[PDB]
Design a protein around this ligand. Sequence first.
Ligand SMILES: C[C@H](CCC(=O)NCCC[N+](C)(C)CC(O)CS(=O)(=O)O)[C@H]1CC[C@H]2[C@@H]3[C@H](O)C[C@@H]4C[C@H](O)CC[C@]4(C)[C@H]3C[C@H](O)[C@]12C
Ligand code: ICS
Ligand code: ICS
Ligand code: CLF
Ligand code: CLF
Ligand SMILES: [Fe+3]
Ligand SMILES: [Fe+3]
Lengths: 382, 477, 522, 522
Amino acid sequence: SNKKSQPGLMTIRGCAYAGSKGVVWGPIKDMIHISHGPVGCGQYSRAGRRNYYIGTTGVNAFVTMNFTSDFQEKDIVFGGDKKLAKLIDEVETLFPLNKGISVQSECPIGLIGDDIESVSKVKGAELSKTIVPVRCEGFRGVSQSLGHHIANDAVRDWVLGKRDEDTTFASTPYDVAIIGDYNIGGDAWSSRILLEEMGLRCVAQWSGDGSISEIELTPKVKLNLVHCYRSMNYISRHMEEKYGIPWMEYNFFGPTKTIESLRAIAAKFDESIQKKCEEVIAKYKPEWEAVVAKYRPRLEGKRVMLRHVIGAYEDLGMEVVKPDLIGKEKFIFQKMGIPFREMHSWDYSGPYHGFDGFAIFARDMDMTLNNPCWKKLQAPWE
Amino acid sequence: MSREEVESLIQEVLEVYPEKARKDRNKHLAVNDPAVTQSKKCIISNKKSQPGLMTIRGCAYAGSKGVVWGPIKDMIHISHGPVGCGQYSRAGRRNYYIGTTGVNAFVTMNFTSDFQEKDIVFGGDKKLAKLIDEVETLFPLNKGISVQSECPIGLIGDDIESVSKVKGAELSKTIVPVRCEGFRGVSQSLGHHIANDAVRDWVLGKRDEDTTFASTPYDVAIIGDYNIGGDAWSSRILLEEMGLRCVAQWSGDGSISEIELTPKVKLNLVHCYRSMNYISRHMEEKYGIPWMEYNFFGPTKTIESLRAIAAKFDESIQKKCEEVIAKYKPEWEAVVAKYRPRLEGKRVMLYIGGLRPRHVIGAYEDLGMEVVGTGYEFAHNDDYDRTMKEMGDSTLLYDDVTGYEFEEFVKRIKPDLIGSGIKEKFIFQKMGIPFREMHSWDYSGPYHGFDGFAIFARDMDMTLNNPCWKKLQAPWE
Amino acid sequence: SQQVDKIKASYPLFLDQDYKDMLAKKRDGFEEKYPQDKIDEVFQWTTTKEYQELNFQREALTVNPAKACQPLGAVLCALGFEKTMPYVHGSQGCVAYFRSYFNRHFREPVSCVSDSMTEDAAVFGGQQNMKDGLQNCKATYKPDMIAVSTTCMAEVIGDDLNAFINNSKKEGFIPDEFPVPFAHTPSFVGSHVTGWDNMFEGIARYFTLKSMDDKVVGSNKKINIVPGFETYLGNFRVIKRMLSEMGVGYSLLSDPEEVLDTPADGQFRMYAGGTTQEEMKDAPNALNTVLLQPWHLEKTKKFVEGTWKHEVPKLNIPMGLDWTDEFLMKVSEISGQPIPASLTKERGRLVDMMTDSHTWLHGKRFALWGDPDFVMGLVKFLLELGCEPVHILCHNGNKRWKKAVDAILAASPYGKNATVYIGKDLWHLRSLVFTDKPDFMIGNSYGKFIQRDTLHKGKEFEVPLIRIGFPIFDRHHLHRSTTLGYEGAMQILTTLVNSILERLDEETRGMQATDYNHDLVR
Amino acid sequence: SQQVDKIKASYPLFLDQDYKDMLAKKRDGFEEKYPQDKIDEVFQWTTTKEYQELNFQREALTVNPAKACQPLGAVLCALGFEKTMPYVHGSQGCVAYFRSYFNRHFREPVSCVSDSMTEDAAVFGGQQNMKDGLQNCKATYKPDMIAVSTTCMAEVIGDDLNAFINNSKKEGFIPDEFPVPFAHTPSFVGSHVTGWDNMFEGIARYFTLKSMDDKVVGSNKKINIVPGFETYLGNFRVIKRMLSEMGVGYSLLSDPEEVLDTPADGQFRMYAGGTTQEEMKDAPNALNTVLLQPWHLEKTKKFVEGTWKHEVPKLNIPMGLDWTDEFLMKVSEISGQPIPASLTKERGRLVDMMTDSHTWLHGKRFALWGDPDFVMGLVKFLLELGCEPVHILCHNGNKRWKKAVDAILAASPYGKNATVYIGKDLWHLRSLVFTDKPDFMIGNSYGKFIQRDTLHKGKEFEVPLIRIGFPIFDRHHLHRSTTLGYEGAMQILTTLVNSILERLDEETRGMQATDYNHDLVR
Ligand SMILES: C[C@H](CCC(=O)NCCC[N+](C)(C)CC(O)CS(=O)(=O)O)[C@H]1CC[C@H]2[C@@H]3[C@H](O)C[C@@H]4C[C@H](O)CC[C@]4(C)[C@H]3C[C@H](O)[C@]12C
Ligand code: ICS
Ligand code: ICS
Ligand code: CLF
Ligand code: CLF
Ligand SMILES: [Fe+3]
Ligand SMILES: [Fe+3]
């Protein structure tokens, strides 16, 4: 596990830049993220992931935008630090409402000896703006895991401690942060509505629909709720060690896991939060019960080849393991005749988390698994 | 082409016709002589079409339902008979109007009795009464109903007049029976006449005893303008900028109340003489309302017509007319300066229904284009009397022209542009000659007034000078 | 007022303030218009279920029909034969309307003549009109054939077409050997598809009835193809291409795709392509005859089975995956030619696009209308896509066709919420889409008005229209599309999925309001 | 909350009142958002001419580029050869992005491998990576050929592709006879089309450089066709069909239409079709080589003219009427085959569509962007249609191509208001369409965002997007369209005119406000 990829074999694994720019930093909406290097890396990742956010794109939000230094031969030969400084000045000129800048390094940045840290410090002092250099060169590591680690280190070193000596924020005993939820199709919103219906206050939610001020406010919360453990465990343990903030993993995939996680989260607070959790569970019971009643008979006994995701499949009467469904590879299984659905990287539908997301998940599973198109692969004359 | 050339061409085209057809069609083709004031000495019109010759004429139903009655927005018009006639004429004419369709306006809707075999065998009067009841139930805001007869109505012995009378008395609603069966007459002209008679008999005299309407000395009605692409609105804005009050405007954007108020106006301004001369003469005879023809096609004709209209009123109206002319002079002068250089010395052949073959010449001359051929589908001899003074010397005049006749005329004349309907548009587009639809304005417009002149010049330039006309021959052929 | 640099057409020239004031004065002073609140109240009432109940109680009034009359289809059928002039015995207004309709749909010249029957012929018949029209047509337009249909006037007065044509041949108006097939096409019976059927049966009977002695079934190794009333040239092209790919000899009778798609090269061609008279003469010698649209080719089916002794297969319209497969298998069985690998690959590619778009297509609710065969093929294809055809309307359908469509719907889980309406017009459909809102409408250009009405209720109540069928007047060159076979299925699927995606993009274009779902990748 | 019968996706579920309140609380409490008035002020500022002047002063910052990197084009070129596996020497994330991009555009599996060069390879090079990757690829996927390109990492550290492949063959990792063409594709030079050119030149050189002694020009009586970077399968199909109609022997080098359109029959086909190695070996024996997209095939042209001794004709992309005519005439002259009547009829039908739609097409203003050859072909066709290409943007264009497009524009009266931009991105085009509003935009899916921005300024300022180009992500099966030849011109014309008519229908759908122009017939 977590070893080097065999050369010459196809694989889904991205690079460190994909794990840093595409996952951790890109969803931050009020910041501008410069893909430092040639044009390709920024072009292919532009609006590739559905990290949903609320904002005015191009004015105060920049998630779906592509900011790049567009490296040429002269930038490779003579470096791009002067180009980086000029680009930062131009970004300040043309996008005055940005609340910060991150510089995500592509591969040639780590090979030509460019010092983006010094440029970041100098320009941040000059413009009184947070400029975060991220050394997420794609060749670093073996997958996006090192990209997540480098991006988390950048968050810790440049953003997280910005309000360490600030006490103006008024805190409540029910302060929680949502860490590692990237709001794929609005997953983080579906989780946050349930959390606030419990009486909890979600002070911070990042990266998905996340702002830099929320990241700075994260060290002020009472509890951290980590959705994606493998991409945010470093920052969670850092916050536990430095600020003494406990963290826990929450699983809002399927009604059973959602109920269990809500009760576990309420167990970390007083009795009022527990009573509110019981109220939320009672309120949402009929809705997911109706969803199960409608869709479970259509999905009972179906085998899925893929815990986090097992709960929702089992809530629909589906067996998890000739698979009837499998949770770049999508089209390969599609052409083999097996219905396929992305259970954690879906590019079209959502959300799937929470009680509202469970209805969409059940509808999508019934739609894909029971579609007549899978019954027509063989010509009647063959 | 000289006069002898045109006459020889006419003979050569008539060569292929049989003796009866050739003898009949000889009397409908002529070479223009502007000095002649009696067109009966050179051309014969308003005669039956020769069978099997691909004519362009419509029927009486088309001239009544599609032209005169259909544009009345607040009335519901029932195509009485089988579904076809109503279906083909639904929203096919661009009589622009303001209203909420299906609630208080019904112009683009198709109301029909949808005659079946049992309705043919046993009549359709009971079905007509039931249909009127259902119309009242489902469209309560209609201000009147017209029943336009299709061909089977007059052949099976149906009595729509009695049904109209009984249902109108029962529902206190104006129900106008129009005997516009398609086989009546020879073209849409009899449809115009029948529709005008229906207007006179059932709608026009409704407010004869009503004096509650307040009249002013500057009260005019717009008769025969059907608001094709907003033409009537562009004329009405010019008329009202002149200090006149346009009390009535029908059929285009017309309501039944405006038709009822028409006998209260001081002047009648007839755009299409062909379709409304009957009602204009009746109104002059009965209410003593003077009527006259106006031509708002092109800045020269528009200015002349505006001055002629203002001459019928006091000096204040004439002063306002001069003010309007001065205000709009720079706009059409700029349009001319932009488009006349691109349109100078281009020859045009036209063939439209009954008014436009002579009315639109002035705007073409305003842009520097000369008209060499003109003709009518259904015009009478008075229309040709007005036409020969407008057309140039030794120009071709054709009445009820056939497809082959007009095709050969175009082939042997070679005009730069042709203005006709949709049934010749693609025929002449495939021959490589630019074509402009002169019925619907090629889904553009308006063409009346100064704004209409700007649109007309832009359309003429865009069609005549389009690159697509230089690409019809393959470079390897 | 106009700016010479930016000239405004009627829209938005009449949105100017002076034009707005002029229209307001005209309305307030003379039109005696109902108050706007009363108009809004009546519109809201027309959108309700009570209004739908009143609307569906109609017995005598038809509002916005979805059908034409028989001689239009007769003219379309006549246009499919080589150097053949459609000749409608009756009044000229009918021919003017037919030509205008087909011009607006195809944007091509349409050749058709009338004998101009008038008030005199209403009391003596149109025998003289028939003689003069036949002679004039043959002398002027030089056709190889004249195919005669009727208007409602000649049908009501009872003109005998056979006797009139025989007399015209007897007095020498036309040569006795000149082909003049005829068909009675009463506009008060059926619809345009019925007229197509009548005209085709008349032509086939004219060319084959009296020469059946020397006919042997399956002696020319061909399969006759009767397309019916078809207004997509791509359908003729796809049928011919699929049959040529299989190596199957065929005779497409009434093929108008050439005369309706003539090139622009500087000359006008009145005639182009078409089925030859030799093709119709040799048609009884075919292995079999396949009716592409069987539900309006019943008289043709009776003639072909009774006279030509052809065992016409029970085939649905080759629309969608399953029915295209059935058509190809039947053609393979009749001709003995195996289905080639190219057609198998085409079917596989259609299935691939179905798999690609099933996520966006599944569960979408459609209200569709058109001709019976086209409507049922569309319903079958929508069921194959996982779509729900909630409102199925066919103004010219019958009870047997409705029973067949109900049987199709009962065989699919996606036809559970589907209702079939026959004899109902587009006012009924407007009521249906107001009371039971579908996601989309599928039909001809007339449905655009329905869309307008829905938008008047609100943006959330708007039902967008997808223009598939006849006639399409407000879009250009859509008559070149294909609805038959795998290619037609792919085109229809692309149109449907891209309409859904366009609607989703329009609904999510609002910045900071709905653009969180304005996804680059769909 | 959710209703089981009517389940809401993210739109419009997050428009619910509780979600709205939660989002408002999140924004007001912790997001520290700028006031909405400030956001409106800044957005209005971004639409002004002052902001455009600031935007066009950019030297270092690129915002929303309209180009990709070379190895993407190299992979697309490699996919066009029979049983060939694209192999990118460098980092794995590049290959992941390439495959994701091509899957999203084509909705098909895309085969590509990487040798996964990592931190260690950044010091000692990727020789071991090359050896292991070649061996593993050949063992696992069994390709007949491995085409090698590079990522930016391998190009920066100066990896010698030739030496690495020779060492891999020498040490038994791959057989010495296995064809392994290579090309250096630095992502900091040019764009994806440059990568396509480099990869094609590498493959042609690999197969032809050392065996030119027995080559005779015109000995196989064929014409070589190099399509360049092409993402429309219809373009390959139309070129092949037009050459087959002409009876012209042709060899289409780098033909990927088969592998990008595999059928769904329950079996995954890794390879399909493509140019065989025999055709590449025999390519110097052709009469001539025609480059479909000469403006990004310069290195290929140099190799073909210098090595194969082929007199490559100076031909524009066969886009639109005149350039399709010139391409057909040049093919006729080279092969000696006359242009058949079918192609003449297709040209005439395109001209007929042009004459049918010129009224709606004349004077329309278009901004457009894409690759150089495609952009100039689109400009040429728009000028042929009477349209005005006001904003012409090409991120990967050069000065000579700009001069050529300027010459094309000066030859037409409709190119007077046109400006060509090279080295500009989609933010520049956003500023241009705000300050100089065109009627429509023509480009890939990214332009949708620009449309959103325009709609934020107002409905009257909205510039609708027409999706012609690469990549198209938010629509389905548009990659199957055609842009070349008369068929491509017809498809583009239909798309443009129907987009205009759809916009007009949307603008005139308001009942009693603008629906006076809601014409049934257009
Ligand atoms: C006013 C606004 C600053 C907002 C701010 O920071 N307020 C202070 C921060 C405190 N608040 C208001 C955000 C919270 C509070 O404190 C509320 S309270 O104190 O409790 O009342 C500044 C910052 C960015 C500026 C625009 C951009 O340059 C682009 C453009 C350049 C041109 O040359 C001139 C026009 C443009 C539009 C500028 C206008 C204006 O000049 C903007 C919006
Ligand atoms: S971070 Fe990870 S690959 Fe946990 S790198 Fe990847 S937005 Fe996946 S299964 Mo893309 S460990 Fe998130 C992920 Fe999961 S980018 Fe997203 S979908 S829940
Ligand atoms: S009514 Fe007549 S055929 Fe005078 S039936 Fe016809 S909207 Fe024409 S030349 Mo269409 S006598 Fe009007 C006419 Fe002229 S429909 Fe319009 S354009 S001025
Ligand atoms: S001349 Fe005129 S348009 Fe002709 S029928 Fe007569 S009123 Fe009508 Fe009607 S349904 Fe069809 S189109 Fe006729 S055959 Fe009858
Ligand atoms: S592993 Fe990752 S995505 Fe790859 S380069 Fe490296 S940071 Fe970037 Fe970039 S421009 Fe193209 S896509 Fe590459 S070859 Fe370079
Ligand atoms: Fe045409
Ligand atoms: Fe696919």
